Coordinates of C-alpha atoms and ligand atoms in Angstrom, one line a residue:
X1 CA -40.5 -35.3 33.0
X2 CA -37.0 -34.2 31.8
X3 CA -34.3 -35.9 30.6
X4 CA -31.0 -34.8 30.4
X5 CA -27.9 -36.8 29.1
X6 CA -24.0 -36.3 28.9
X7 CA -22.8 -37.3 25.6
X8 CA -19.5 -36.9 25.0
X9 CA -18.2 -36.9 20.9
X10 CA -15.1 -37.9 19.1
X11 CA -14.6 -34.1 18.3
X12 CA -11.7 -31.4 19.7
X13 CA -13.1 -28.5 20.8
X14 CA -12.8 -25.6 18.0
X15 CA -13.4 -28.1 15.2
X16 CA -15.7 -28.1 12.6
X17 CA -16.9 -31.1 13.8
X18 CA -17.8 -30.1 17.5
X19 CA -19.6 -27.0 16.3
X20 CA -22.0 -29.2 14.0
X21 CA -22.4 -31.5 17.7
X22 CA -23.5 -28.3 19.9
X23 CA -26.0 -27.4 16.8
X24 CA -27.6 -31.3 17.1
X25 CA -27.7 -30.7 20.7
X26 CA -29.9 -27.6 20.2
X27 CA -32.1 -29.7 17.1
X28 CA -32.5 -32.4 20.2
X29 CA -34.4 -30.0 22.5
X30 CA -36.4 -28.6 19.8
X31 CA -37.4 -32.0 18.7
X32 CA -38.7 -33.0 21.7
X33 CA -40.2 -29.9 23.4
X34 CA -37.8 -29.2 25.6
X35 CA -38.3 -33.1 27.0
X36 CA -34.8 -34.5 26.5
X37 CA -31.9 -32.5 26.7
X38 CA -28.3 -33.4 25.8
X39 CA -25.2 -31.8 26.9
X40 CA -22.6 -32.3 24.6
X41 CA -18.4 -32.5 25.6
X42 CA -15.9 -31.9 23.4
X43 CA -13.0 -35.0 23.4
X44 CA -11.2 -35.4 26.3
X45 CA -13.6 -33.4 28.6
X46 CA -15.0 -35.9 30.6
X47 CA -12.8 -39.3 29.7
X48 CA -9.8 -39.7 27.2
X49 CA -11.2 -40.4 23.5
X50 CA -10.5 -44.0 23.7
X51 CA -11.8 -44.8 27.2
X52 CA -15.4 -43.4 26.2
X53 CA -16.5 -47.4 25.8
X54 CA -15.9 -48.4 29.3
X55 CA -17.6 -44.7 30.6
X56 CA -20.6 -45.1 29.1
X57 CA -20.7 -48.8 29.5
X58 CA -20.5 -47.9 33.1
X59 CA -22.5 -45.1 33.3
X60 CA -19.9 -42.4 33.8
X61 CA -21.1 -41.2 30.5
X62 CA -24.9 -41.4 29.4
X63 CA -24.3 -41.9 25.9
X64 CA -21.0 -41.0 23.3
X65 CA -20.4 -39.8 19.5
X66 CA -17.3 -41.8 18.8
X67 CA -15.7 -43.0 15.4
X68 CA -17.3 -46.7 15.2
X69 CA -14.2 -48.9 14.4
X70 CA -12.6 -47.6 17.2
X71 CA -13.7 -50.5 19.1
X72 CA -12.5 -53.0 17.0
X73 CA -9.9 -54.6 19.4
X74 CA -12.8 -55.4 21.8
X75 CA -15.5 -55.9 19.0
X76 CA -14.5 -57.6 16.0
X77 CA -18.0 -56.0 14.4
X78 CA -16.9 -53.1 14.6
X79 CA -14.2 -53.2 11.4
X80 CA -17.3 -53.7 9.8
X81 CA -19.6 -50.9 10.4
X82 CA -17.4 -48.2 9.0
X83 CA -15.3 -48.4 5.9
X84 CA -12.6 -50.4 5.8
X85 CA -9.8 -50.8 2.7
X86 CA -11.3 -50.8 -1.1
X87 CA -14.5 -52.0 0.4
X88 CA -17.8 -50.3 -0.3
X89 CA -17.1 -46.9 -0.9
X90 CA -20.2 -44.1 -1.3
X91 CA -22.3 -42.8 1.5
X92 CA -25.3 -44.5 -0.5
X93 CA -23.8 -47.8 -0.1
X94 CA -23.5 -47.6 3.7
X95 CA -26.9 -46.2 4.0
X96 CA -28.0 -49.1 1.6
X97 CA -26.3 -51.7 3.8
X98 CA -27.3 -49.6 7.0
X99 CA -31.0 -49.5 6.7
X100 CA -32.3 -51.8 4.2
X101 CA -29.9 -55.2 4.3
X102 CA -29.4 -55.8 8.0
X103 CA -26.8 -53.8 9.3
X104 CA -28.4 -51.8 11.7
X105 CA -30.1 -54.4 13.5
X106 CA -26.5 -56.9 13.3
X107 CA -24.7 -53.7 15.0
X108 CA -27.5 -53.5 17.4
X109 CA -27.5 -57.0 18.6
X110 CA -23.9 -56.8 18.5
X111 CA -23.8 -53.6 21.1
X112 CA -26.9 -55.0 23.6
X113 CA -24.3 -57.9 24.5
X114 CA -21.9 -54.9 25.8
X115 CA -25.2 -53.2 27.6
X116 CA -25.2 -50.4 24.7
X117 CA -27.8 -49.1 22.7
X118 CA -26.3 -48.5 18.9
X119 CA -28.7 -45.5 18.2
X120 CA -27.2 -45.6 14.2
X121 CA -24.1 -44.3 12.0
X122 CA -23.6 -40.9 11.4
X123 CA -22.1 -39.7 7.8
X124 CA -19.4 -37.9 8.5
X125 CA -16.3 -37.6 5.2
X126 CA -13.6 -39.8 3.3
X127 CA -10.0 -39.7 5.0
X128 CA -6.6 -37.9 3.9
X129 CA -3.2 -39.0 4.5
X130 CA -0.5 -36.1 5.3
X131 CA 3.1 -36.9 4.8
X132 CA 6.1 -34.8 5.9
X133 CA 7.8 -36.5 2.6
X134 CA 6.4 -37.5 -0.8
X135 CA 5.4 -41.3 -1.1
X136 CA 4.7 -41.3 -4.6
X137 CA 3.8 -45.2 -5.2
X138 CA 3.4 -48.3 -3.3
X139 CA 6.3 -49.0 -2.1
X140 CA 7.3 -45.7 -1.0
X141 CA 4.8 -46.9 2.0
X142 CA 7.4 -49.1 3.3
X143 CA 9.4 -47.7 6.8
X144 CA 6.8 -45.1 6.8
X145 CA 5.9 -44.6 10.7
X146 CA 2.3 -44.3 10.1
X147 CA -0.6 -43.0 12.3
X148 CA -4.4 -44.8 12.1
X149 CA -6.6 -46.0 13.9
X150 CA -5.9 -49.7 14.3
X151 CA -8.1 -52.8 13.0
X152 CA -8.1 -53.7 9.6
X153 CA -7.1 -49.9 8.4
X154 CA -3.5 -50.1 10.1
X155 CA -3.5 -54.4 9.3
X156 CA -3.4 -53.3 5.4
X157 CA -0.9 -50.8 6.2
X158 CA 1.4 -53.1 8.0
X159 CA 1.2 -55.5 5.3
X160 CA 2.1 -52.7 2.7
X161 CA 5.9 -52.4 5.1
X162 CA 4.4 -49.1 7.2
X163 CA 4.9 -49.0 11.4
X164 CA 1.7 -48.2 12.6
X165 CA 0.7 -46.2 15.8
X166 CA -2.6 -45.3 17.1
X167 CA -2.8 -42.0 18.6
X168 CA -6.3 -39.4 19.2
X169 CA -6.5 -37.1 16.4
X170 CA -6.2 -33.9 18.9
X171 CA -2.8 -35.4 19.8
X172 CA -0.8 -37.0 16.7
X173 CA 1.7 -34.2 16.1
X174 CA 3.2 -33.6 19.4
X175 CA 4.0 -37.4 19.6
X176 CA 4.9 -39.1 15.6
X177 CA 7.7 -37.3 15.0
X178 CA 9.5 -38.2 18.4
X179 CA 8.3 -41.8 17.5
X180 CA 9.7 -41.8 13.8
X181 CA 12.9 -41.1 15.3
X182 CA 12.9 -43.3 17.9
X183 CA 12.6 -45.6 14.8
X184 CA 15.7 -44.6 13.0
X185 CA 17.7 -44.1 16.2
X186 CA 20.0 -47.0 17.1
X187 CA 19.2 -49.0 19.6
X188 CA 21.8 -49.5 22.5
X189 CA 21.1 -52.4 25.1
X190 CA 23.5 -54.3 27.9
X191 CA 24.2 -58.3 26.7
X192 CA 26.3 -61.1 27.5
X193 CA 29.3 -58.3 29.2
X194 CA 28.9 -56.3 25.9
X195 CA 27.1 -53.2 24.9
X196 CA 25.3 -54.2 21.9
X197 CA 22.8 -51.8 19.2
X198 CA 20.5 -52.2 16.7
X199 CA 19.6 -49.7 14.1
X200 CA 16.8 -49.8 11.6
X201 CA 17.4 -47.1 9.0
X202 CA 16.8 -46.4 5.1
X203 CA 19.4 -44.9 2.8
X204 CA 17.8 -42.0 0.8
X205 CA 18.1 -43.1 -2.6
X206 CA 18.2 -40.7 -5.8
X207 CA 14.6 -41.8 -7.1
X208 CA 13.6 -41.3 -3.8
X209 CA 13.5 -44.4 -2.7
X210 CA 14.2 -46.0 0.2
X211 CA 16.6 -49.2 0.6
X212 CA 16.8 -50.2 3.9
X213 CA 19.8 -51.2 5.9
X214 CA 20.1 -53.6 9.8
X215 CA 23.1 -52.4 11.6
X216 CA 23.8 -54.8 14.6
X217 CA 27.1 -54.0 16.8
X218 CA 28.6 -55.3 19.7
X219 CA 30.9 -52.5 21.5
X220 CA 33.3 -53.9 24.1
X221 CA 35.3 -51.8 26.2
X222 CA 39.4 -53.2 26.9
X223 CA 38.9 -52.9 30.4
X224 CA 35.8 -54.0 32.9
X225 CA 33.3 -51.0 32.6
X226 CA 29.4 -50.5 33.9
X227 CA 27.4 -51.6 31.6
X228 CA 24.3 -48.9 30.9
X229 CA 20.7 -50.0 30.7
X230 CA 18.9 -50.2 27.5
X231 CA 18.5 -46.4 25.9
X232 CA 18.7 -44.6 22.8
X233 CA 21.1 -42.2 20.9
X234 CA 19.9 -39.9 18.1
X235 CA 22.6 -39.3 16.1
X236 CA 22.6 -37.0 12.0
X237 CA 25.6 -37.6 10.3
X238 CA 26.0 -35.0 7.4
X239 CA 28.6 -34.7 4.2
X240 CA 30.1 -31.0 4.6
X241 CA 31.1 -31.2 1.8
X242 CA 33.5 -33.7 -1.1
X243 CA 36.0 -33.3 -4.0
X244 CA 34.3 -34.3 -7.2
X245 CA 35.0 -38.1 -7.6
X246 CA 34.6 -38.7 -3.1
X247 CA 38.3 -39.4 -3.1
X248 CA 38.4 -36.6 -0.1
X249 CA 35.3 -36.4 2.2
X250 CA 34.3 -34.1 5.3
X251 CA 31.5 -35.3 7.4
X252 CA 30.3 -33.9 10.8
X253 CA 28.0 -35.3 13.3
X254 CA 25.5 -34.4 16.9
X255 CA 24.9 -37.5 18.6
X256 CA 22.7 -37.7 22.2
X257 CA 21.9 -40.5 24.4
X258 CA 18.9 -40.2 25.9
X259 CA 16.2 -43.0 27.7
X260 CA 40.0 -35.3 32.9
X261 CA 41.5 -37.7 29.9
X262 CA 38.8 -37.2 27.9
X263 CA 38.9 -33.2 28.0
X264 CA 36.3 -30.9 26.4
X265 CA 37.9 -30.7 23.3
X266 CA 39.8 -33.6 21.6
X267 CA 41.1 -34.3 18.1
X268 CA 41.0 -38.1 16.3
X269 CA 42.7 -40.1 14.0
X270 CA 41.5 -43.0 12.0
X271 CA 42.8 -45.4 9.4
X272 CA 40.4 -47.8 7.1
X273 CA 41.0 -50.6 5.0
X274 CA 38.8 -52.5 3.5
X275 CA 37.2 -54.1 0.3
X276 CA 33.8 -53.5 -1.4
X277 CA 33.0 -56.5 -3.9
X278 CA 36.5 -57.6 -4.0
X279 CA 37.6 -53.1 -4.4
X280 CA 40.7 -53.0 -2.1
X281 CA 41.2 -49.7 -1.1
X282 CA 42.5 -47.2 2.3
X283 CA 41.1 -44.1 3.8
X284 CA 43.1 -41.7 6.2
X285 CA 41.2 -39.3 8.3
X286 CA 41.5 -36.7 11.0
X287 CA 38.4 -35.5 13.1
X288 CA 38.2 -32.9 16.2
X289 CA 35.1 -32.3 18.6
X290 CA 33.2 -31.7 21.8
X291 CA 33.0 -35.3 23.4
X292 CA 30.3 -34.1 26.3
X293 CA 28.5 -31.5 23.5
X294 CA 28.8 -34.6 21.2
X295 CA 29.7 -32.4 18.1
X296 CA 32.2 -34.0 16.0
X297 CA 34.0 -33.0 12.2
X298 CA 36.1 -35.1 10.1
X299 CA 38.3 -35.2 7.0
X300 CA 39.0 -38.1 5.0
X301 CA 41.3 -38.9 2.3
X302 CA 40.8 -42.1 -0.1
X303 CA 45.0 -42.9 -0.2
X304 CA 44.5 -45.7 -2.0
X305 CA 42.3 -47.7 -4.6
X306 CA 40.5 -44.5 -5.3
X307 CA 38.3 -43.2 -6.3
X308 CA 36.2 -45.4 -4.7
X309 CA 33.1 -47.4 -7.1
X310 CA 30.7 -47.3 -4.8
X311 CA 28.4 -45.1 -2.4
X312 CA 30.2 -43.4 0.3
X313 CA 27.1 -43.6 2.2
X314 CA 28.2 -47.4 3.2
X315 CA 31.6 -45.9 4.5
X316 CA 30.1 -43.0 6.6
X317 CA 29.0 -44.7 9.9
X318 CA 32.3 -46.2 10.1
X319 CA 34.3 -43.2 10.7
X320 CA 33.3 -42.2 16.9
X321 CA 30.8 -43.3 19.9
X322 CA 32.9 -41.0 22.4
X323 CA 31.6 -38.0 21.1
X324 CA 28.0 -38.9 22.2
X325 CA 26.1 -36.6 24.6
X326 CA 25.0 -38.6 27.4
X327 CA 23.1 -37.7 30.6
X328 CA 24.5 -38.1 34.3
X329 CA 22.2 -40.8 35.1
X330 CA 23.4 -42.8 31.9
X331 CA 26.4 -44.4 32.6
X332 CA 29.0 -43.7 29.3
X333 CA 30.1 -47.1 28.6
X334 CA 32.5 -45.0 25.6
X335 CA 33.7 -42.4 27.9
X336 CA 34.5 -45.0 30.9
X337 CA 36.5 -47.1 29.0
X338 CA 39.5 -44.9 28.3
X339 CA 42.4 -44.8 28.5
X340 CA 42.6 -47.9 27.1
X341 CA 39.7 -47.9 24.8
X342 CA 37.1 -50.2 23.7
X343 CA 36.5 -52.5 20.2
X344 CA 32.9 -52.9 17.8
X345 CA 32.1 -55.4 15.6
X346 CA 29.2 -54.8 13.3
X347 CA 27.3 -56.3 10.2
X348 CA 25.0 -54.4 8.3
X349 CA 22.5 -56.7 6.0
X350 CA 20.4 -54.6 3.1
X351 CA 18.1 -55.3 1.2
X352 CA 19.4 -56.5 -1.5
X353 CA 21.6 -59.1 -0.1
X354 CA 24.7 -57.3 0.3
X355 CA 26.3 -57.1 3.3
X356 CA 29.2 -55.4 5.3
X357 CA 31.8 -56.8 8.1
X358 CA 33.0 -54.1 10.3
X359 CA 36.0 -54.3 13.2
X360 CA 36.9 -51.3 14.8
X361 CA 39.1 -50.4 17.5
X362 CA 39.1 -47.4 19.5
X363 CA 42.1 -46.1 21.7
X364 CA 43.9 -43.1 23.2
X365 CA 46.9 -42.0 22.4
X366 CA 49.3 -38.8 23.5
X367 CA 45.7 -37.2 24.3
X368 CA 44.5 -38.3 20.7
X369 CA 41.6 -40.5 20.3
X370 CA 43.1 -43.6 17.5
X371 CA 40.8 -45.0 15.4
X372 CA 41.2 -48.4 13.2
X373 CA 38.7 -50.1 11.0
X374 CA 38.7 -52.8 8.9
X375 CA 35.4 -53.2 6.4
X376 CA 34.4 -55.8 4.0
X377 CA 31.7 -55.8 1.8
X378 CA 30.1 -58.3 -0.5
X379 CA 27.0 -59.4 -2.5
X380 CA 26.0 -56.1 -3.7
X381 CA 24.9 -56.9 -6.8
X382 CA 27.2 -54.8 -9.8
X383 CA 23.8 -52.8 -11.3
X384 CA 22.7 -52.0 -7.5
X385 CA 22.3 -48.4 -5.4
X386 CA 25.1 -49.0 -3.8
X387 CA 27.8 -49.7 -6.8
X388 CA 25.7 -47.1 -8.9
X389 CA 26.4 -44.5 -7.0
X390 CA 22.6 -44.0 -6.2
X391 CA 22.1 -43.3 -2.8
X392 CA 21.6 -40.1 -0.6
X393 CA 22.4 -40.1 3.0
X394 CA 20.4 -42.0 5.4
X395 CA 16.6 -41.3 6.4
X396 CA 15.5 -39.4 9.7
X397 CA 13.1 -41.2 10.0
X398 CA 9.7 -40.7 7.7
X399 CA 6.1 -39.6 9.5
X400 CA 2.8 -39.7 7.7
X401 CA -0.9 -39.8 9.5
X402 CA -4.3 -40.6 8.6
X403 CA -6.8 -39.2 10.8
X404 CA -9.9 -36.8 9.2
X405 CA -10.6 -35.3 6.0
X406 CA -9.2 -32.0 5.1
X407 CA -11.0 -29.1 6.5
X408 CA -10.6 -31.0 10.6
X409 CA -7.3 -31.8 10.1
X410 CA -7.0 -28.3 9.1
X411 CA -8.7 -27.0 12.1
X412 CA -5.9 -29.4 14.3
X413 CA -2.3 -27.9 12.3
X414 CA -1.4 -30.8 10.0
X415 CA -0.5 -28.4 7.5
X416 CA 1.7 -26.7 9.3
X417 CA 3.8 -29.9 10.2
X418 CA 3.6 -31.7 6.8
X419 CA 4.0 -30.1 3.4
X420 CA 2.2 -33.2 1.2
X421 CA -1.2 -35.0 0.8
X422 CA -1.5 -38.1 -0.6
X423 CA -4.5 -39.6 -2.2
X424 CA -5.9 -42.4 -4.5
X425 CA -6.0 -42.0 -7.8
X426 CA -9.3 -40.3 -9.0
X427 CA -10.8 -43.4 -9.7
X428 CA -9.9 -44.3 -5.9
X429 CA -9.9 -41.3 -3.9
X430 CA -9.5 -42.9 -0.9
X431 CA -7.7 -46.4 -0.4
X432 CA -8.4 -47.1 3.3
X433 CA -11.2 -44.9 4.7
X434 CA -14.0 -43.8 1.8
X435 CA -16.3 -43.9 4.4
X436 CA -15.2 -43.0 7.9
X437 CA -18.9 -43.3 9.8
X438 CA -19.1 -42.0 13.4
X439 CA -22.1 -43.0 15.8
X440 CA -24.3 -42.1 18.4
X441 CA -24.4 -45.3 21.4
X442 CA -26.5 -44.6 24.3
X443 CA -26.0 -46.6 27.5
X444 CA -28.4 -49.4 27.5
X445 CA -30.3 -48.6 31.3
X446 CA -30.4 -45.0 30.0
X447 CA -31.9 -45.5 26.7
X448 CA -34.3 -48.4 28.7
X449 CA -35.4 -45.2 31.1
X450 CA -36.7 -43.1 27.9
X451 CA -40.4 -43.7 27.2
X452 CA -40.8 -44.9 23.6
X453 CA -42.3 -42.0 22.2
X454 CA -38.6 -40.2 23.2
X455 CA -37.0 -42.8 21.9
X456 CA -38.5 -42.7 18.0
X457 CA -37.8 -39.2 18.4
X458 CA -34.2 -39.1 19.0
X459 CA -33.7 -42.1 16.5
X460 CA -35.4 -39.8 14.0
X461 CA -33.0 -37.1 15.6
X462 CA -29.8 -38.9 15.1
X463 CA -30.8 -40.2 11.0
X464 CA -31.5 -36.3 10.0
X465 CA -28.0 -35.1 11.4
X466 CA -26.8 -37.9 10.4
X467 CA -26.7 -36.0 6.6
X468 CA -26.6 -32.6 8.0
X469 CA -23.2 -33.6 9.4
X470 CA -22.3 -35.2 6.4
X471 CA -23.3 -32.3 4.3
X472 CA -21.8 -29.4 7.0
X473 CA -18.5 -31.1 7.1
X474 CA -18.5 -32.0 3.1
X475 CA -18.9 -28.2 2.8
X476 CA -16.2 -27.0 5.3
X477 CA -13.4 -29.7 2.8
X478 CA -14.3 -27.3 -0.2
X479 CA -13.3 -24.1 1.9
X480 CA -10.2 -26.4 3.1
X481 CA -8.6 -27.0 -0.1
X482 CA -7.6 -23.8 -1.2
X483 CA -6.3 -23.2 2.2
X484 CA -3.7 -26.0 1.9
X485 CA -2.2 -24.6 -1.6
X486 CA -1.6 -21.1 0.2
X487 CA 0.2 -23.6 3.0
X488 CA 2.9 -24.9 0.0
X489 CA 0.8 -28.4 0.6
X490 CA 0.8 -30.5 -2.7
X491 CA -1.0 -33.3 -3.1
X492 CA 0.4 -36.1 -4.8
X493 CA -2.1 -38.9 -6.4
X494 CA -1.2 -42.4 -6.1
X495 CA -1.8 -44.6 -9.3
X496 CA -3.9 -47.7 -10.3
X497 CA -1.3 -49.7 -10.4
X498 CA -0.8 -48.8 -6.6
X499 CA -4.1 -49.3 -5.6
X500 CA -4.2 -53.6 -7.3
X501 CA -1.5 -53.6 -4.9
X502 CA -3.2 -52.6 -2.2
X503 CA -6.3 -54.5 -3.0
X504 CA -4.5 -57.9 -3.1
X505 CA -3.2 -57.5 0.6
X506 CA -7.0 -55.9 1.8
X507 CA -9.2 -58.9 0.9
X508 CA -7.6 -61.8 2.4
X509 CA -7.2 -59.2 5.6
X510 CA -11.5 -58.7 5.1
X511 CA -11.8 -62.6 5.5
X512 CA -9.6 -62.9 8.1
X513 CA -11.5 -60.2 10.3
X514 CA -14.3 -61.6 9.6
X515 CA -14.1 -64.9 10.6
X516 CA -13.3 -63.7 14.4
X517 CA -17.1 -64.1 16.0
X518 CA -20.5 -64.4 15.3
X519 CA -21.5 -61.1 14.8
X520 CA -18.1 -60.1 12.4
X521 CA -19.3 -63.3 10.2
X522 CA -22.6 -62.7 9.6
X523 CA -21.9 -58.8 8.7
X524 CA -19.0 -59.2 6.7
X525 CA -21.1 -62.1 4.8
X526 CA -23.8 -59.8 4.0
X527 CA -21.7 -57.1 2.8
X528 CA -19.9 -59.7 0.3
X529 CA -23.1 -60.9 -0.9
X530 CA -23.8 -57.0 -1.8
X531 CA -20.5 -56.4 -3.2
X532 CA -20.7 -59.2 -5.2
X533 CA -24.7 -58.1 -6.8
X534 CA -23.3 -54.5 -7.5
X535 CA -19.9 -55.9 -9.0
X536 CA -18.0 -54.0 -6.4
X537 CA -16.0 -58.0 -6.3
X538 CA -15.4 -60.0 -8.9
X539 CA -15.9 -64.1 -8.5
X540 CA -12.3 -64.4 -9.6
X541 CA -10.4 -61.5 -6.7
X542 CA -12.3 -64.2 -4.5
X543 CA -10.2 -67.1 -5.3
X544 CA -9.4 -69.6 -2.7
X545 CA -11.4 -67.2 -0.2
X546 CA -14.4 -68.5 1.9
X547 CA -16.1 -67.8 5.2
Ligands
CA601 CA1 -8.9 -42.0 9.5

């Protein structure tokens, strides 16, 4: 008699995307006379987005409209039946590979071992990437904190120097930022009696570069003080303002941790000497600030061996970890320690082999917090950012996230939250996702119960909206665009050059992959043997590569 199913799609409510679903849905009944009906439910309505595997695996759900590779954790095949990076790349191709070489019956094999019925793939769009800040080449990727969707896409990524996250497209915004931070904040954590920190953060360099910089320090108090547990302090340390050569600096900071002597308002003192590739030199400053609303301000004054050849940026950090913000159930390790104070020791490595010794010491004196340091750094080479005089402050931290193409991520905000696209170069539109195929997957006793005739039907179903997604959602990105240039978005197109870099890390990654099970092999090995009769792969890229 009649048949109705729950099927749940990858698709937010009050996307383009979910409206094409509900349309499908209607096509579904009309197809069938009324005999099978499907409810459709937006993402999230009946199980999170990435726990729709296990619900219809189980039942909970009769059948879902996910994003394939989703799975690829659990089902190496998976990688493999949607795009993955500079692999085939049209619609056509997928189709070809789909219906005519073997895919469809690989993927279907592969799903009946998990009790799933893979109805077929869905054409859905190629993929954008929306940056808060402009990465301009290849290596502009590196310390990027990235959102994908795991696999091979976010292995390719990884390789290129970007932290990955995988987050549900309804939910990257809230969430990347705070993580991107978290990044660039330092580190604190209790070891060996000492409280000890890490930080992991880029200087901003004039070509808008990034050369990154490991700060490791061990603070010691001069008395026996609780240790904290492990937690976090964001801390933005900005130059007020500077004479014209940096011989007389004032810098300011707000610093928070998060997971009677020291008075509301206190006043510093510190004195530096140190060398920079063998540059002798002195610094005398005086700094005032709100210790417990952790706002600080300082003057400095280059007395001797100025003006200084080299960045200023390598001397900022060096110049007050009482004037951090931290919450009642945080024990302050900074705070606790005076009257008598507390000592650092740090070494910051870059990457370009120079490197900085740091010894501080922190005390109290008359009501006035006194602070010595004594620096030495070496190895930076003479033609280098950091004796050129290249360098901009330090990063706050860098988000960028794939997730749809333009006119969904529209419909979910990203333009709102960051101001540039980047794509492929026109020749390569799209470097990791050129074909980003969703899927219909029925729960195996469900689809079982249908009688056959039902069964051609909805197959039939799935291929023609299959194209009518493809072709509602292609039309939807050509509304989008002009949207985004009203929005200040720009898009920024990457270069050839930047996508042979990319293509030398993605096909080693492709064997690798691969070569996980059965059904990974013998689809991956089918699409080679395609790539290879269209000359999508050359014989040579292949070198020293075999399944
Ligand atoms: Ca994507």
């Amino acid at each position: 008699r009649r048949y109705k199913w729950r099927i749940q799609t990858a698709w937010d409510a009050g996307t383009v995307g979910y409206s094409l679903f509900q349309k499908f849905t209607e096509r579904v009944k009309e197809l069938t006379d009324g005999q099978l009906e499907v409810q459709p439910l937006p993402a999230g309505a009946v199980v999170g987005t990435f726990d729709m595997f296990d619900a219809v695996k189980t039942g909970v759900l009769d059948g879902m409209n996910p994003f394939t590779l989703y799975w690829a954790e659990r089902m190496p095949v998976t990688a493999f039946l949607s795009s993955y990076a500079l692999g085939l790349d049209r619609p056509d191709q997928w189709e070809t590979w789909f219906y005519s070489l073997g895919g469809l019956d690989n993927a279907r094999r592969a799903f009946a071992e998990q009790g799933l019925f893979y109805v077929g793939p869905v054409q859905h769009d190629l993929n954008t990437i929306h940056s808060k800040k402009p990465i301009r080449r290849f290596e502009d990727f590196k310390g990027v904190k990235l959102r994908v969707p795991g696999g091979m896409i976010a292995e390719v990524f990884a390789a290129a120097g970007a932290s990955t996250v995988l987050l549900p497209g309804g939910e990257v915004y809230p969430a990347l930022e705070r993580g991107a931070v978290t990044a660039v904040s330092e580190r604190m954590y209790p070891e060996d009696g000492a409280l000890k920190s890490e930080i992991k953060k880029g200087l901003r360099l004039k070509d808008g570069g990034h050369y990154a910089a490991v700060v490791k320090t061990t603070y010691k108090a001069k008395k026996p003080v609780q240790l904290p547990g492990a937690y976090v302090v964001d801390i933005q340390l900005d130059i007020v303002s500077h004479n014209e050569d940096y011989t007389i600096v004032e810098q300011c900071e707000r610093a928070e941790g998060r997971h009677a002597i020291v008075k509301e308002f206190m006043r510093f003192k510190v004195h530096m000497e140190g060398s920079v590739n063998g540059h002798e030199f002195e610094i005398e400053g005086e700094g005032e600030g709100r210790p417990y609303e952790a706002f600080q301000t300082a003057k400095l004054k280059v007395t001797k061996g100025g003006p200084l050849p080299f960045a200023w940026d390598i001397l900022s950090p060096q110049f007050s970890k009482a004037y951090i913000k931290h919450p009642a159930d945080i024990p302050d390790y900074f705070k606790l320690s005076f009257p008598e104070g507390f000592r650092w020791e740090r070494v910051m490595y870059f990457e370009d082999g120079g490197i900085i010794h740091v010894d501080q010491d922190s005390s109290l004196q008359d009501g006035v917090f006194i602070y010595k340091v004594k620096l030495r750094g070496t190895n930076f080479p003479p033609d280098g950012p950091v004796m050129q005089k290249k360098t901009m402050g330090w990063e706050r931290g860098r988000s960028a996230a794939d997730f749809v193409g333009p006119a969904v991520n529209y419909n979910l905000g990203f333009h709102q939250e960051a101001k540039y696209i980047i794509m492929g170069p026109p020749e390569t539109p799209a470097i990791h996702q050129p074909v980003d195929l969703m899927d219909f997957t029925i729960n195996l006793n469900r689809w079982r119960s249908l009688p056959k005739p039902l069964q051609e039907r909805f197959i039939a179903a799935v291929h023609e909206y299959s194209w009518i997604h493809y072709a509602g959602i292609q039309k939807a990105n050509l509304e989008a665009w002009p949207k985004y240039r009203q929005a200040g978005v720009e898009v920024i197109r990457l270069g050839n050059e930047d996508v042979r870099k990319f293509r030398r890390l993605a096909i080693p990654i492709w064997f690798k992959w691969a070569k996980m099970d059965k059904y990974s092999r013998e689809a991956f090995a089918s699409q080679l043997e395609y790539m290879r009769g269209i000359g999508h792969v050359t014989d040579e890229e292949l070198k020293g590569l075999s399944l």
